[PDB]
């Protein structure tokens, strides 16, 4: 009866959630390890010529001093800047803890939805 | 109606005339108009009517303002091109309609679309254009006014397109005005 | 014409070879071929997604080395022209391998 | 036959559906421009400031903010008046064609 | 529940593509060791930054990426094999 | 057939010039003075021209003597 | 119909890749065609991932040429599958029709 | 069907989009409420990036809801206009 | 006659809707290039070297001065390099934008012209 159609609809509307969530996960990873690996040591050590994004297609050479200043945005209106040690502390939860719930609400949710 | 001929005075089939379908009035006084008559499209007169300006002209030219001449091209891409295109269309249409003055008509007959930049020039020149006529109407008015049907202008001159004064009235039999080439 | 018919020793056959000094060759060593001279073929011409834009390049850059080893083996065999079997029961032949085997003056 | 003339009148209707879209796109973008102008006039009260295209932020002084809040908004302004002087032409093209097709072609 | 395919197919394909990426990273390491092996200038990227300074310093992240890929991917290959064996 | 109007080949109206739109025909008529000089040098004093040429265009060659005759059709042309 | 559907799927998965490679190729053609003549303003290197190495034009030309040959071969493969599908469309589709008829 | 369907859909969406905008402007308040948007900060409003102490953020972030709330309530009541 | 044509008109409608999704793709592809043109003016304004706040992936911002306009870079193909020189960074990426916009015309003109027959099929379907 309707079981097949509703099962397929639930699978589709939860696979879209899967795609979206593992869509934002990679760049927040990048935000963590890019900084924590390169900048936290080398920029805190000495100023170097660098590459920064001018746009998502225009890429421009740059140089950075030990600025050690970083800025986070969650929207088009609200901004906060941070140091180079607490910023990764606040960012690391937003993926390390977020994956456990969101992906369990994905893997375990799929396990249930195969019967739900 | 014998000027059309094959070596001698010979009228062709009823298609060379045209019936009328007025439901109003009375059948007791019904008659037939002297000359050609336009119907089932005209319901209100032109903005200049009851004037008498000689040498009726008739065209079948695609005189509409558009990207091309006889066809419509793709949407404009160079946004600056519109300023140039408006002026070029204005000059081109005015140059075409200049030779309409050679006849000085009261009514211009256009099977294709008459254009507002042409109609503005005509009203500045005290001329009017009737639009949306049928294919047989081209020959009908051409014979009635003493002309040959010409697709595009500047191939026209007096006594070869049109004869005498253009004396036309628009009036209603019933609730709708009809164009009467009287 | 009819009169220009002639008896010919050896073999004559329609054109295949181009841009390989096709004018003439003396003592042309002719080698029969009944084996593949192209990349391996399967359900697709590759074993990965045909949209893996970065990946077909990085795998066929060594597949080109493979076919280059094949044509170099043909060279050290001593061939001057090649004799390739009927095609339908075999994979096609890479024309770039033909281009390489042209430059040391070998036809197919 | 009247088939090609009917094709022309439906093409005129398609041009109407072009007209409404081409005016509404610019009036929404102009509303966004006015909102941005109000915001930029509000925020000039403070000095140490950055602007860019969103994907970057360039430092400047206050007079640069005054210059930029005008030099691009005035281009959008000249462009809106260009689009009225275009929209009037094309809306004439559609409306007068309707006036001379609908009560005419049904004959 | 025969959920193995839905839980092993994507893992197999992603492990394959990660192995291909690691092999290509090894190829890039070899290339920078012979092609444009010039000491004086070499643009090398850490996340979103070039520094055209590292020649021998490139390995400082070459080895990092090598192990962070290989250990995680063969651990997750053992994980997908575990998903396979728990059902069969 | 030189013409004021786009009924035959050679005449165009796409040009963006209020003058050239009209005087293309006049320039062609002045150039055809060379053609009528050529026909006179060959031996001809009258040139026949297919349909679509203007009578006022015929006047240009009537004035110069090498007059032009209108209304010859495709069968006349082939004959 | 089994064979017709299989050939349709083969057509689809070959043509998707062919179309995507065409979409990228329409850009790379021009980019490389002015790149081969604008030297000094741009110079050929390889951005093989997160690293840069000096690169020469000829191997890039060989790469794009063998892209072209590969994709043309795939086009003939796809079109051969198209004739296969249209050939099956008669008899592999009459398979069910003849059993329902008699 | 259509003459009513598209009209209702358009009139609903014209403010459903603004309802989604209010949803965004309400989920963005978490930074001010708990993430402590109170220091001297380089705040941006789109296209511009201001280094200011955040005093205006409360009136600005209330002025949007005080309008969009009545907009969406008007939409909700308009949905009941004709059935 | 009519019933089979009406039945196949559903498949005709679905292919037209696929091509309409294609032209919606056409409206959504201009973006990258249009903000590229909008970001043109940053290049010449900052050719002395100037402080920039730029995104790192999407969601991060870090201060940094841009320099070395003579090797401004664009990605292309399988991993090839486009090192934009200084004079190019001032003026010549305008023509580079012209060519990217030329591909954008391969998108809009050269595909809307062939979708003219799509709209013609819509008009013909009334019969």
Curated annotation (Swiss-Prot), chain E:
Binds specifically to cytosolic chaperonin (c-CPN) and transfers target proteins to it. Binds to nascent polypeptide chain and promotes folding in an environment in which there are many competing pathways for nonnative proteins. Keywords: Acetylation, Chaperone, Cytoplasm, Mitochondrion, Nucleus, Phosphoprotein. GO terms for biological process: chaperone-mediated protein folding; negative regulation of amyloid fibril formation; protein folding. GO terms for molecular function: amyloid-beta binding; protein-folding chaperone binding; unfolded protein binding. Coiled coil: none annotated. It comes from the Eukaryota. GO terms for cellular component: cytoplasm; cytosol; mitochondrion; nucleus; prefoldin complex. Belongs to the prefoldin subunit beta family. It comes from Homo sapiens. This is Prefoldin subunit 4. It is found in: Nucleus; Cytoplasm; Mitochondrion. Heterohexamer of two PFD-alpha type and four PFD-beta type subunits. Interacts with URI1; the interaction is phosphorylation-dependent and occurs in a growth-dependent manner. The gene is PFDN4.
Curated annotation (Swiss-Prot), chain G:
GO terms for cellular component: cytoplasm; prefoldin complex; protein folding chaperone complex; RPAP3/R2TP/prefoldin-like complex. It comes from the Eukaryota. The keyword Chaperone applies. Keywords: Acetylation, Chaperone, Isopeptide bond, Ubl conjugation. The modification N6-acetyllysine is found at residues 9, 54. Heterohexamer of two PFD-alpha type and four PFD-beta type subunits. Component of the PAQosome complex which is responsible for the biogenesis of several protein complexes and which consists of R2TP complex members RUVBL1, RUVBL2, RPAP3 and PIH1D1, URI complex members PFDN2, PFDN6, PDRG1, UXT and URI1 as well as ASDURF, POLR2E and DNAAF10/WDR92. Belongs to the prefoldin subunit beta family. Binds specifically to cytosolic chaperonin (c-CPN) and transfers target proteins to it. Binds to nascent polypeptide chain and promotes folding in an environment in which there are many competing pathways for nonnative proteins. This is Prefoldin subunit 6. The gene is PFDN6. The chain holds residues 13 to 114 of 129 of the full protein.
From Swiss-Prot, chain H:
The keyword Repressor does not apply. The keyword Nucleus applies. Coiled coil: none annotated. Keywords: Chaperone, Cytoplasm, Mitochondrion, Nucleus. One of its GO terms (molecular function) is unfolded protein binding. It comes from the Eukaryota. One of its GO terms (biological process) is chaperone-mediated protein folding. Its main location: nucleus. It is found in: Nucleus; Cytoplasm; Mitochondrion. GO terms for cellular component: cytoplasm; cytosol; mitochondrion; nucleoplasm; nucleus; prefoldin complex; protein folding chaperone complex; RPAP3/R2TP/prefoldin-like complex. Belongs to the prefoldin subunit beta family. Heterohexamer of two PFD-alpha type and four PFD-beta type subunits. Component of the PAQosome complex which is responsible for the biogenesis of several protein complexes and which consists of R2TP complex members RUVBL1, RUVBL2, RPAP3 and PIH1D1, URI complex members PFDN2, PFDN6, PDRG1, UXT and URI1 as well as ASDURF, POLR2E and DNAAF10/WDR92. Interacts with URI1; the interaction is phosphorylation-dependent and occurs in a growth-dependent manner. Binds specifically to cytosolic chaperonin (c-CPN) and transfers target proteins to it. Binds to nascent polypeptide chain and promotes folding in an environment in which there are many competing pathways for nonnative proteins. This is Prefoldin subunit 2. The lineage of its organism: Eukaryota, Metazoa, Chordata, Craniata, Vertebrata. The gene is PFDN2. The chain holds residues 30 to 112 of 154 of the full protein.
Curated annotation (Swiss-Prot), chain I:
Heterohexamer of two PFD-alpha type and four PFD-beta type subunits. Binds to MYC; interacts with its N-terminal domain. One of its GO terms (molecular function) is amyloid-beta binding. Keywords: Acetylation, Chaperone, Cytoplasm, Nucleus, Phosphoprotein. One of its GO terms (cellular component) is cytosol. Transmembrane segments: none annotated. This is Prefoldin subunit 5. One of its GO terms (biological process) is regulation of DNA-templated transcription. It comes from Homo sapiens. Highly expressed in pancreas and skeletal muscle and moderately in other tissues. Belongs to the prefoldin subunit alpha family. The modification Phosphoserine is found at residue 46. It comes from the Eukaryota. The modification N6-acetyllysine is found at residue 32. Binds specifically to cytosolic chaperonin (c-CPN) and transfers target proteins to it. Binds to nascent polypeptide chain and promotes folding in an environment in which there are many competing pathways for nonnative proteins. Represses the transcriptional activity of MYC.
């Amino acid at each position: 009866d309707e079981q097949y159609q509703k099962y397929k609809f639930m699978e589709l509307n939860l696979a879209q959630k899967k795609r979206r969530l593992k869509g934002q996960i990679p760049e927040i990873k990048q935000t963590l390890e890019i900084l924590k690996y390169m900048q936290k040591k080398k920029e805190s050590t000495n100023s170097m010529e660098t590459r920064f994004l001018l746009a998502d297609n225009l890429y421009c050479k740059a140089s950075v001093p030990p600025t050690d200043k970083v800025c986070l945005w969650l929207g088009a209106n609200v901004m906060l800047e941070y140091d180079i040690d607490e910023a990764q502390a606040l960012l690391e939860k937003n993926l390390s803890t977020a994956t456990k719930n969101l992906d369990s609400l994905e893997e375990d949710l799929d396990f249930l939805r195969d019967q739900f | 109606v014998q000027f059309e001929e094959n070596g001698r005075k010979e009228i062709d089939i009823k298609k060379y005339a045209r019936v009328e379908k007025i439901p109003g009035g009375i059948i007791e006084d019904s008659c037939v108009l002297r000359g050609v008559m336009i119907n089932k499209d005209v319901t209100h007169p032109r903005m200049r009517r009851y004037i008498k300006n000689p040498r009726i002209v008739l065209l079948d030219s695609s005189l509409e303002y558009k990207k091309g001449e006889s066809q419509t091209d793709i949407e404009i891409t160079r946004e600056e091109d519109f300023t140039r295109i408006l002026q070029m269309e204005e000059e081109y249409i005015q140059q075409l309609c200049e030779d309409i003055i050679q006849l000085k008509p009261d009514v211009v007959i256009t099977e294709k679309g008459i254009s507002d930049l042409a109609q503005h020039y005509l009203m500045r020149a005290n001329i009017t254009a009737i639009r949306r006529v049928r294919k047989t109407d081209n020959n009908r008015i051409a014979r009635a006014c003493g002309a040959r049907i010409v697709s595009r202008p500047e191939e026209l001159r007096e006594d070869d397109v049109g004869t005498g004064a253009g004396l036309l009235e628009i009036k209603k039999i019933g609730d709708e005005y009809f164009t009467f080439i009287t | 014409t009819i009169d220009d018919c002639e008896l010919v020793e050896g073999l004559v056959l329609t054109q295949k070879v181009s841009n390989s000094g096709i004018t003439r060759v003396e003592k042309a060593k002719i080698g029969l071929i009944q084996f593949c001279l192209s990349a391996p073929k399967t359900d697709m011409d590759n074993q990965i997604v045909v949209s893996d834009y970065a990946q077909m390049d990085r795998v066929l850059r060594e597949e080109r080395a493979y076919i280059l080893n094949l044509v170099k083996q043909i060279k050290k065999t001593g061939c001057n022209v090649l004799l390739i079997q009927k095609s339908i029961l075999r994979d096609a032949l890479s024309d770039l391998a033909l281009h390489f085997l042209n430059k040391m003056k070998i036809m197919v | 036959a009247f088939t090609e003339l009917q094709a022309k009148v439906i093409d005129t209707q398609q041009k109407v559906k072009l007209a409404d879209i081409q005016i509404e796109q610019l009036n929404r973008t102009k509303k966004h421009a006015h909102l941005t102008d109000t915001e930029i006039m509000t925020l000039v009260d403070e000095t140490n400031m950055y602007e860019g295209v969103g994907r970057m932020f360039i430092l400047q002084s206050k007079e640069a903010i005054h210059s930029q809040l005008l030099e691009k908004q005035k281009i959008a302004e000249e462009k809106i008046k260009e689009l009225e002087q275009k929209k009037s032409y094309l809306e004439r093209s559609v409306k007068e064609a309707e006036d001379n097709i609908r009560e005419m072609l049904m004959a | 529940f025969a959920r193995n395919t839905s839980r092993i197919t994507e893992l197999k394909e992603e492990i394959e593509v990660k192995k291909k990426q690691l092999q290509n990273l090894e190829d890039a390491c070899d290339d920078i060791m012979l092609a444009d092996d010039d000491c004086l200038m070499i643009p090398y990227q850490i996340g979103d930054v070039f520094i055209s300074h590292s020649q021998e310093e490139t390995q400082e992240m070459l080895e990092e990426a090598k192990k962070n890929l290989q250990e995680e991917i063969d651990a997750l290959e053992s994980r997908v094999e575990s998903i396979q064996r728990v059902l069969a | 057939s030189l013409q004021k109007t786009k009924m035959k080949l050679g005449v165009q109206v796409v040009i963006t010039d209020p003058e050239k739109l009209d005087q293309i025909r006049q320039r062609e008529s002045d150039i055809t003075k060379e053609r009528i000089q050529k026909i006179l040098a060959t031996g001809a004093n009258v040139i026949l021209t297919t349909g679509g040429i203007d009578d006022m265009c015929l006047k240009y060659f009537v004035e110069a003597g090498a007059m032009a005759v209108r209304r010859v059709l495709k069968r006349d042309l082939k004959r | 119909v089994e064979k017709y559907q299989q050939l349709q799927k083969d057509l689809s998965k070959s043509m998707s890749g062919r179309q995507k490679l065409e979409a990228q190729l329409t850009e790379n053609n021009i980019v490389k065609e002015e790149l081969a003549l604008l030297d000094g303003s741009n110079v050929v290197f390889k951005l093989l991932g997160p690293v840069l190495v000096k690169q020469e034009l000829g191997e890039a030309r060989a790469t794009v040429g063998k892209r072209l040959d590969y994709i043309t071969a795939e086009i003939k493969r796809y079109e051969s599958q198209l004739r296969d599908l249209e050939r099956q469309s008669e008899q592999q589709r009459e398979t069910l029709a003849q059993l329902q008829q008699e | 069907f259509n003459r009513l369907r598209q009209e209702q859909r358009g009139l609903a969406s014209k403010a459903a989009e603004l309802e989604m905008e209010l949803n965004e402007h309400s989920l963005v308040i978490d930074t001010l409420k708990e993430v402590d948007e109170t220091r001297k900060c380089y705040r941006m409003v789109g296209g511009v990036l201001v280094e200011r102490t955040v005093k205006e953020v409360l009136p600005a972030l209330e002025n949007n809801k005080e309008q969009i709330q009545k907009i969406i309530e008007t939409l909700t009541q308009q949905l009941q206009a004709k059935g | 006659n009519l019933p089979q044509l009406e039945m196949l008109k559903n498949q005709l409608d679905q292919e037209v809707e696929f091509l309409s999704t294609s032209i919606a793709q056409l409206k959504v592809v201009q973006t990258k290039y249009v903000e590229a043109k909008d970001c043109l003016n940053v290049l010449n304004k900052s050719n002395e070297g100037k402080e920039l706040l730029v995104p790192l992936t999407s969601s991060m911002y870090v201060p940094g001065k841009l320099h070395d306009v003579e090797h401004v870079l664009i990605d292309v193909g399988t991993g090839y390099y486009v090192e934009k020189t200084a004079e190019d960074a001032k003026d010549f990426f305008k023509r580079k934008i012209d060519f990217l916009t030329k591909q954008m015309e391969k998108i809009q003109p050269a595909l809307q012209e062939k979708h003219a027959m799509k709209q013609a099929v819509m008009e013909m379907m009334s019969q």
